[PDB]
Design a protein around this nucleic acid. Structure first.
Lengths: 271, 46, 94
RNA sequence: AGGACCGAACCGACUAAUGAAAAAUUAGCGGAUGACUUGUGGCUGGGGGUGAAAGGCCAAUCAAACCGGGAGAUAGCU
RNA sequence: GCUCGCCGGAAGACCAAGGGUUCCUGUCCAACGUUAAUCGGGGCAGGGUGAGUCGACCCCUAAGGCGAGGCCGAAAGGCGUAGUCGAUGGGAAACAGGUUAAUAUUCCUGUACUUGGUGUUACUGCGAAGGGGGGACGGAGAAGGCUAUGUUGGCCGGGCGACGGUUGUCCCGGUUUAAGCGUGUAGGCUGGUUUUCCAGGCAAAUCCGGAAAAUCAAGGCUGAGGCGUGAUGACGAGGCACUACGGUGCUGAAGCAACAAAUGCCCUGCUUCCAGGAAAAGCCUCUAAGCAUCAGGUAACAUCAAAUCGUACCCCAAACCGACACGGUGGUCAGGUAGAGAAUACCAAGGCGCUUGAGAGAACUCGGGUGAAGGAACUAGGCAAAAUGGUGCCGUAACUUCGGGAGAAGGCACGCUGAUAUGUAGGUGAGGUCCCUCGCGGAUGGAGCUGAAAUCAGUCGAAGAUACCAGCUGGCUGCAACUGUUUAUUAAAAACACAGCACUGUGCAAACACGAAAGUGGACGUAUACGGUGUGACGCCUCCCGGUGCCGGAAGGUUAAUU
């Protein structure tokens, strides 16, 4: 649930917490963990390539299963877990053959729930089956775009996709963006919505909270000198130019999709 | 007042030492230059 | 097993000093100058063969050379290896 | 509980008067569990870096570092 | 040598880094030392650094670096796989005393430990580049158990006072002892043991994981401290022999108890929070190829082994970074009285008086003290000074986002002695007595020790938070919501950032950014996400598309290469 914190200090006043009691209070499943060091938004050349990244808390990498290939074995949900690496919540599941995996926790999922992947699998939340097997009009998440690759669409805290149509070898998806997209009908998808839907209701409430999430502060181009940004300079507050990136490209409207290879799959762009 | 030079032997060697100079071309040229000049101490190496 | 020639080349000299004299008289320990490359076991072997005397143990150390100035010109003395060789109880050395 | 309070260390540098000091002193001053501070090592290189942005900082040097070279640049000027 | 004075969370002690002989001894005083110099971190000569257990080396890896092939690139070269390097992190082992002019966990004395070989007898499944476990991990908070350490008493030794008193409830000093081995406690974690099966752990697995079934409630792991031993020892106040006045040799009492107590240890624990918290080896374990009655494994016992390098000295400084014998510099140690305290004052241990002195006692300057009467009249401005200053209790407005405002404001008490109470409330806790699955056990018990806070009565002073220390307060108002950041060295702000808001892009080989490219970041993320721009908590809100941009359209006009 969301929780407005009492204003016992400025910087706590405007805070809203998103508290799920059902998460695991404990150390995660260590076998599925692995190291994940921070970039600072800097590439192999050592240059900053994406500004405003830096610092934040040390995080491990949970090995989430997005490919979801344990066909026919039924699994049961052991617990839900906090993943620092994503807006969603993860679920540690236990297959009957003794293997455990992390999966995106869907909306209704909880400890004790049974889930299943496969063509034969049942059409219920958390189950995963090819979209030619999934009825039209259903909500799914963790959608593969290429068969066998692993889910790439609809992984964020409260996303999902609509299968609006199945026309032969393809099905047409309604993406969260509003973009309509063809996808091969043999690609895989998980039933239901992804879990942590009130994720958006949280509000950080202070500068430090943003820092904790590895976000360095943002300087406005207009606050700079001309040598730095197109917006710089001006005695007092001047802005007599069309908005642009630091690299001179228009920002308020100018489209930038250039991919002519996948134009065919886009049924309708978002609006 | 913390002045610029804050010595550290290892750091000195890695930065300027013989092997470092050897590693890359430009360093090798520097070495050659110094040899030509007649430098007694070719490198920072003690 | 150390070669005789190497053994002979190990031992440079006896070291005379107050501390050395004290070590000799009290702890039955001789203080030698030895080759800088000479290891402890080597030194011991050489002691045993060339002075004909049982060794308990050898401690070694490296003496660094002093920087001196002859007139205006600076110059450094050689470094050299010192060895305290402790000799078995009742071992009297000439 | 807290980018909570008072306050030493520690980090800073608002006022004041005054070469031991190429930016210090003393007296006061701000923060002091955090967007803190600090050691060791690492990476980013010059129209390039980094920049909670002052054209700041990049070895007492910055509206384009230093070293060497073109080079005895050119100087209707002194 | 005796006085005086200063530091004492340092101006003491020990290290790292950095320096590199500055260490110690003798000797010299030209130069160096802001003066003199017999002295010196100066000159010259000699001496000095001892390790299986400290550190490096070594095994393991992080960020990162290099990188066979490889991909890419006019050349140079870039990226990067396998790999290999890389500590600031993980990985076996030593303590006490004595000694040098100068080293010591390194020498000596005592008492230990480690992990390798080799050989043994005893046994008999060993075996990895592979599987599993472990190592292995955050912040804050709270206690409880402890010790370091300190105080008092007891004990032991010495003393009987340069001036009134001082054989006592008097004075001074000491009252220390390790690692190791044994015990396995306060406490923490976990249900154990056996059997059966199984699409999992790249193959196999007797291991892990998962299913069942049986049976017992104690099983294991961890763990400070204490106790015992170590120790008939060592050390020991000071006494006694020699004296090159430096010291050397002999000798040696007591060596207990209580209380208090860390920020250190149990604790890598427990509780809790969200921001969700290295890796690999060592270590344990499982098997595979293999080998097969051999090797290898574990078992004790014997022997050998532990190489190499560092070890002096300075290290908040006269030895490092600052041109100087001139501010900066990470870690560890942390006594007493008062105190909340690592603040502050005075002291201990220890270390210093800052390498020019001597006079004088003009102006003027600096740093301080006090000041009649006035009390901001000063001044751009109360700048600077002065003032406030503690604990407890009473009391406290507007406004408010109901948290605040608020230590609002303002007041009262405060010393010492006695009594309450030859020391209370509390804390601690010995004997005795009882229980007992027997121990570091549980009950009862209260000796002794410690010990606030209050009330009443008296008492001194001008003054009792007496020194050091230690808020000035209130009223209206602009700006910025707030904590933060900034022009290293004239600007700390109303500037930047901020949480929040909005627009816009981006469907993943994402947009974008660095890269002739390969590739990398974005992100091991996927529209509840990421990028860009503006605005900037919260509250109430928030006409013009002509111009320039952007988006969409494509009927016509015009229009490249080409032909």
């Amino acid at each position: 649930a969301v929780v407005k914190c009492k204003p016992t200090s400025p910087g706590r006043r405007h805070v809203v917490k998103v508290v799920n009691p059902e998460l695991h209070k404990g150390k995660p499943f260590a076998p599925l963990l692995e190291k994940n060091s921070k970039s600072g938004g800097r590439n192999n050349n050592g240059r900053i390539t994406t500004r405003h990244i830096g610092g934040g808390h040390k995080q491990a990498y949970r090995i989430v299963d997005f490919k979801r290939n344990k066909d026919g074995i039924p699994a049961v949900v052991e617990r839900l877990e906090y993943d620092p690496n994503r807006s969603a919540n993860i679920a540690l599941v236990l297959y009957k053959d003794g293997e455990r995996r992390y999966i995106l926790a869907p909306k209704g999922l909880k400890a004790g729930d049974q889930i299943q992947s496969g063509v034969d699998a049942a059409i219920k939340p958390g189950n995963t089956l090819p979209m030619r097997n999934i009825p039209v009009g259903s909500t799914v998440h963790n959608v593969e775009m290429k068969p066998g690759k692993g889910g790439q669409l609809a992984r964020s805290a409260g996303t999902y996709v609509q299968i609006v149509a199945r026309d032969g070898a393809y099905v047409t998806l309604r993406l969260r963006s509003g973009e309509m997209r063809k996808v091969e009908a043999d690609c895989r998808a998980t039933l239901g919505e992804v879990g942590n839907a009130e994720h958006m209701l949280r509000v950080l409430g202070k500068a430090g909270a943003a820092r904790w999430r590895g976000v360095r502060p943002t300087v406005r181009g207009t606050a700079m000198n001309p040598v730095d940004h197109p917006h710089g300079g001006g005695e007092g507050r001047n802005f007599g130019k069309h908005p642009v990136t630091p690299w001179g490209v228009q920002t308020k409207g100018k489209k930038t999709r250039s991919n002519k290879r996948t134009d065919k799959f886009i049924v309708r762009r978002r609006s | 007042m913390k002045r610029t030079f804050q010595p550290s032997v290892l750091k000195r060697n890695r930065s300027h030492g013989f092997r470092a100079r050897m590693a890359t071309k430009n360093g090798r040229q520097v070495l050659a230059r110094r040899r030509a000049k007649g430098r007694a101490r070719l490198t920072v190496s003690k | 097993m150390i070669r005789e020639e190497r053994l002979l080349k190990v031992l440079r000299a006896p070291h005379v000093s107050e501390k050395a004299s004290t070590a000799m008289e009290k702890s039955n320990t001789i203080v030698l100058k030895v080759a800088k490359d000479a290891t402890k076991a080597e030194i011991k072997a050489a002691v045993q063969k060339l002075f004909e005397v049982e060794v308990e143990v050898v401690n070694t150390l490296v003496v660094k050379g002093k920087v001196k100035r002859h007139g205006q010109r600076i110059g450094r003395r050689s470094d050299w290896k010192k060895a305290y060789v402790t000799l078995k109880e009742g071992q009297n050395l000439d």
